[PDB]
């Protein structure tokens, strides 16, 4: 029916260039006319007003949260009826181009910055459900970090059942691949862990596999077949006989043979220990965001 927001005036904003094309939006850089302040304009097809209202609700809850995209205004085009979200502008230096240029220091700021966003969101009852490099705006010069694209985000109620067709391929946690419906905001910690692996090992996306059976197999190449079998037993999840047989052949290599001369310097012992904790198969045994932020890997950047 209507939007749950006091709508602004489309005339207050200018559009500069396209910077994004999502499944629900076209995204532009722009400005606020009276201020000159740079902003991002996210233009949505006026389709699924409930979903827009949910995204608006979520972003309003997260206002003034650290390193979270900030909703400055919502406007409706009076002639086309399209809706635009007006967001803060964050520079997006693509981490895939910065392999061997991002230091240990940059990676700790990057991961810690996103953890701050997740702690605030989780504390306010929201899980993002699509953490990945593509939704993390990283400024290699300023070190600014922003977690964006809350369209898949959901409000979290314990022992509630949720749709497992979330996240992006190769960031889906075992709880989504195995269809555990009562998954938790710890999904966001697995996804950030997969991001950390990609940065440490110079490979984004880090995990692979053509289908979900092969994706489970490839996780266990590192993490061990037994942990996956034990997980599937503990939560009553279904694995085909063939996959169980394959999983029992995998001792789990962890992070061995992933450290060569080009990434040796960023693969510190503290980083691996955080990665191992974050990529824990049992979604109920991963660190919370708050716990991960207390890891010694963040000791040297904690000051600021
Ligand atoms: N605040 C922002 N600052 C800079 N770029 C942004 C911002 N929000 C979105 N983008 C860019 O636009 C792209 C698509 O935006 P996104 O928010 O993912 O669109 P969507 O259609 O709502 N969701 P999805 O279909 O999952 O992409 C992003 O991946 C970025 O490249």
The answer to the question of whether 51 is labelled as a binding residue is yes
Name the residue at shortest CA distance from atom 13 of ligand 1. Answer: 20
Q: Residue 23 CA: which ligand 1 atom is closest?
A: 25
CA of residue 94 to ligand 1 center, whole Å: 14
Q: Which of 18, 25, 169 to mutate to test the pocket of ligand 1 (most atoms within 8 A of CB)?
A: 25
Domain ranges for the chain: 10-88, 95-298
Structure determination technique employed: X-ray
Residues in the chain, overall count? 304
Name the residue at shortest CA distance from atom 30 of ligand 1. Answer: 20
Structurally, at CATH architecture level, domain 95-298 sits in: Orthogonal Bundle (1.10)
Euclidean distance between CA atoms 193 and 200, whole angstroms: 11
Q: Residue 25 CA: which ligand 1 atom is closest?
A: 21
Residues forming the active site:
130
Structurally, at CATH architecture level, domain 10-88 sits in: 2-Layer Sandwich (3.30)
Token pair recorded at residue 282: 């049992």
DSSP labels for the chain? Answer: ---SS----GGGEEEEEEEEE-SSEEEEEEEETTT--EEEEEEE-S--HHHHHHHHHHHHHTTT-TTB--EEEEEE-TTT--EEEEEE------GGGGTTTS-HHHHHHHHHHHHHHHHHHHHTTEE-S--SGGGEEE-TTT--EEE--GGG-EE--TT----S--S-TTT--HHHHTT-TT--THHHHHHHHHHHHHHHHT-SS----SSHHHHHHHHHHHH-HHHHHHHHHHTT----HHHHHHHTT----TTTT---TTTTTT--HHHHHHHHHHT-SSTTSSPPHHHHHTSGGGTTTTT-
């Amino acid at each position: 029916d209507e939007l749950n927001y006091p709508l602004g005036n489309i005339d207050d904003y200018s559009v500069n260039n396209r910077i994004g094309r999502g499944k629900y939006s076209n995204v532009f850089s722009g400005h606020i006319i009276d201020s000159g302040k740079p902003i991002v304009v996210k233009v949505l097809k006026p389709v699924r007003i409930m979903k827009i209202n949910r995204e608006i609700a979520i972003l309003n809850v997260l206002r003034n949260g650290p390193n979270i995209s900030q909703l400055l205004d919502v406007v409706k085009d009076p002639d086309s009826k399209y809706i635009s979200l007006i967001l803060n502008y964050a520079e997006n230096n693509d981490v895939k181009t910065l392999f061997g240029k991002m230091t240990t220091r940059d990676i700790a700021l990057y991961i810690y910055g996103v953890l701050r966003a997740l702690a605030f969101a989780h504390k306010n009852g929201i899980m993002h459900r699509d953490v990945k490099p593509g939704n993390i705006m990283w400024n290699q010069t300023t070190k600014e970090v922003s977690l964006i694209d809350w369209g898949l985000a959901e409000f979290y109620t314990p022992d509630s059942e949720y749709q497992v067709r979330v996240a992006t391929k190769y960031y889906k946690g075992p709880e989504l691949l195995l269809s555990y419906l009562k998954y938790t905001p710890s999904l966001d910690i697995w996804c950030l862990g997969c991001t950390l692996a990609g940065l440490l090992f110079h490979k984004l996306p880090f995990f692979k596999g053509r289908d979900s059976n092969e994706q489970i197999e490839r996780m266990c190449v590192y993490l061990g077949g037994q942990a996956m079998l034990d997980y599937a037993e503990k939560y009553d999840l279904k694995l085909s006989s063939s996959l169980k047989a394959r999983l029992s052949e995998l001792k789990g290599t962890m992070w061995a043979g992933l450290i060569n001369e080009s990434n040796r310097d960023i693969c510190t012992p503290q980083a691996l220990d955080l990665l191992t904790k974050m990529l824990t198969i049992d979604h109920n045994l991963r660190p919370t965001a708050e716990q991960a932020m207390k890891h010694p890997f963040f000791d040297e950047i904690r000051d600021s």
